[PDB]
């Protein structure tokens, strides 16, 4: 009840395993990285 202001697209989304907002997920899809040490198993 924020006076008619809608923050759903920047508030966290509980459904996703990572509680990222819609815009945060959009940004993470937009940027593609090259590894971050995700425990290389050889």
């Amino acid at each position: 009840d924020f006076g008619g202001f809608n923050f759903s697209q920047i508030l966290p989304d509980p459904s996703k395993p990572s509680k990222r907002s819609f815009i945060e997920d959009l940004l993470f899809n937009k940027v593609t990285l090259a590894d971050a040490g995700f425990i290389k198993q050889y």
Partner: protein, 43 residues
């Protein structure tokens, strides 16, 4: 945690699967006993 507090230390093998230490430069192997080995994303 600092020498004065304790001489007990923990060793982290960065980017290594925890099974690869049983699979396996450092002469000391006194930590191969394990029983408290924890596999983190760091190693």
């Amino acid at each position: 945690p600092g020498t004065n507090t304790s001489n007990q230390v923990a060793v982290l093998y960065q980017g290594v699967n925890c099974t690869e230490v049983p699979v396996a430069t450092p002469t000391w192997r006194v930590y191969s006993t394990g029983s408290n080995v924890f596999q983190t994303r760091a190693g």
